[PDB]
Amino acid sequence: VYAWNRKRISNCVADYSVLYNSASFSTFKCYGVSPTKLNDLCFTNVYADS
Amino acid sequence: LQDVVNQNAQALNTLVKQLSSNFGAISSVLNDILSRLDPPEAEVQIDRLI
Amino acid sequence: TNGVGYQPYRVVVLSFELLPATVCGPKKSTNLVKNKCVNFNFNGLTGT
Questions:
Q1: Of all residues in chain C, what percent are helix, strand and coil, respectively (each to 5)?
Q2: Residue contact B32–C47, C-beta within 8 A
Q3: From the CA of B14, how many Å to the nearest CA of chain C?
Q4: 8-state DSSP, B30
Q5: Is the separation of the CB atoms in A7 and A47 below 8 Å?
Q6: Which residue from A32, A37, A15, A9 is spatially nearest to C25, judged by alpha carbons?
Q7: Out of the domains of life, which is the source (chain A)?
């Protein structure tokens, strides 16, 4: 956790509905966006911290 | 006459500029908030904007 | 043996920022139309 994996995400056609409907995640908490209506929304780049 | 015309124009311009204020919300434009937020949070932001 | 309060949990955090769009989701594009009041979605910018 003190050396969390950092990933750059860009240049994709990324579907997030499959992640929401997977139901294998105990917690899915989103701030600034909604779990739904996010497929048609996009930004310049994505940062992933694991 | 120039002074009263300028006063009216300044009031209109001030209203137009004030239309682009966040008012404590995440964004100053309503379309982005509507397209980004779920109905409850979007409702709160619209309340603040109104 | 650890309970739900101490069991391991894998966490991924996704962060975005708005400062041209490069990665966009699975929204099918539509042919451009002019000279009529229509709804447009340009890189996530929604307007009419």
A1: 0, 25, 75
A2: no
A3: 24
A4: H
A5: yes
A6: A15
A7: Viruses
